[PDB]
Design a protein around this ligand. Structure first.
Ligand SMILES: CCOC(=O)N1Cc2ccncc2C1
Ligand SMILES: CCOC(=O)N1Cc2ccncc2C1
Lengths: 301, 300
């Protein structure tokens, strides 16, 4: 037993991380088959970042403008192109450590592991949720751009995130591996803020199931409720709506414990109104919303 | 910016994890050079659970009784010995993925990454601290025995923990990689219980220094405290005593933020008295004790 925020083992991804330098900018690239993926903003001087014309800055560049280092080995760049906000540097050598992989775009509420990197060197791994406002609450310092997020399904790595920027509130924004931003953000030095975040209702309920499974039971009660009734409480507390699709996804946990979702929604309703009456749940004084149902089932079964 | 419980990249440890089977018992082993390390309790049966005589049970085993398996490959055991509570299976192949490594015994308050593994396959990675009662608050299911805890400072892997057992309170106990238990625990299923646990005071102060570095100041106050007055208050909330050593270790974080250690001690005395009044520090509504002074500097 026990319940902890747990990342996927990162080794399949550690083997894909390289250093990418263009002029004075060094950051992280992802080396899969014979291509290195990194943020297109590596080609930008500080001056360029204010109003960059990427079309024009890039036709001005050539293969030899990009230094790509896998540990202590220079890769030769033999091609360059841009897809949305991601730069593709074709190299002379296919990565012998390329795992089985897909590029995937995740949905708000879904979780993934981040491998934080600096000068193409893996440095830490931690679990994030894609927030409803399309930010993630990461831990990133200068040089962390190009760090990637992923899931693992059997032997397949699904890459879902590349880190581009930090917003003024301390939260992080990036793209999928096809260079499409998550959220209404642009890769320019301009004024950008995260929308007001919302609480991921289905993940809080998953976490209450994990708490029960680990013998934290105090917050439970004899009552039940309806979507309509709960959702009017949810809207009031800045909670995402609970859909019928969410109730079905919590199916397994509802069975495995004897508490039905609207039975658990009754408990959560009470915690929102009345608070935790000075207790913790799984060593937290907050309602944790960065564990999905799958995360709980994975870790608890 | 941001502040997260951050584990080390697990790849260097993934390449060492194998499955060990003895009788009906399967658990994880650690394959370094020509040796597989695993808990010696893999050689116990149902009636060996209470008062196993390990020296008696091991002399009755031959190399071929131990089925070691790295992915598909069966590894052939050519030698076995016990060191304390750890079994060492010598094998005919050296692990080609063996990283630079060392074995280190850590003190209470120290943190490490855990690679949780089932049937020799790594499942997930997370951070833990050695609690002052010599347990860890982990996430471990049946089969996780032989999972290890480690740090990776400067490309050298320091192994500090191997998982042996879960105690009745749902907390976890194991050994260093020389097989000596952390705490007064033994590898028998005779009734055991952890000492009352305490909060790791030096780590809470480091985490308050992290919050200030990330631009939180709301909990500072105009007060100071003597070290002795701090300890007399903090022990009334089940906090560990803060020693001069702990004060010395925070000197760098003090210097970087310009808040004296005993000034920060007055902030913590106040937070214990007041709670947080609907506020949070670095995303938490509790005081966090599983980041060391070194972890704060590494991450910030
Ligand atoms: C006060 C210093 O902050 C920075 O310059 N950055 C760069 C940067 C880029 C991406 N994520 C986070 C960061 C932190
Ligand atoms: C079926 C055994 O009961 C459990 O749920 N355990 C075993 C066990 C053994 C070692 N560490 C953790 C655990 C969790």
């Amino acid at each position: 037993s026990g319940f902890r925020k747990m990342a996927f083992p990162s080794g399949k991804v550690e083997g894909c991380m390289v250093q990418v330098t263009c002029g004075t900018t060094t950051l992280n690239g992802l080396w899969l088959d014979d291509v290195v993926y990194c943020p297109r903003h590596v080609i930008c001087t500080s001056e360029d970042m204010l109003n960059p014309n990427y079309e024009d800055l890039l036709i001005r560049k050539s293969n030899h403008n990009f230094l790509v280092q896998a540990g202590n080995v220079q890769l030769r760049v033999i091609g360059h192109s841009m897809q949305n906000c991601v730069l593709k540097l074709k190299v002379d050598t296919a990565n012998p450590k390329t795992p089985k992989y897909k590029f995937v775009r995740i949905q708000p509420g879904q979780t993934f592991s981040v491998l934080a990197c600096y000068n193409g060197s893996p440095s830490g791994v931690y679990q994030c949720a894609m927030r409803p406002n399309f930010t993630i609450k990461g831990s990133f310092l200068n040089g962390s751009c190009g760090s990637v997020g992923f899931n693992i399904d059997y032997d397949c790595v699904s890459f879902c995130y590349m880190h581009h920027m930090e917003l003024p509130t301390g939260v992080h924004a990036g793209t999928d591996l096809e260079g499409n931003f998550y959220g209404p953000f642009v890769d320019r030095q301009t004024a950008q803020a995260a929308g007001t975040d919302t609480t991921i209702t289905v993940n809080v309920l998953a976490w209450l199931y994990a708490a029960v499974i680990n013998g934290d039971r105090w917050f439970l009660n004899r009552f039940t409720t309806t979507l309509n009734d709960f959702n009017l409480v949810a809207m009031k507390y800045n909670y995402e709506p609970l859909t019928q699709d969410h109730v079905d996804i919590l199916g397994p946990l509802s069975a495995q414990t004897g508490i039905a979702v609207l039975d658990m929604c009754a408990s959560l309703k009470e915690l929102l109104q009345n608070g935790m009456n000075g207790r913790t749940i799984l060593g937290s004084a907050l309602l944790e919303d960065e564990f999905t149902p799958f995360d709980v089932v994975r870790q608890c079964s």
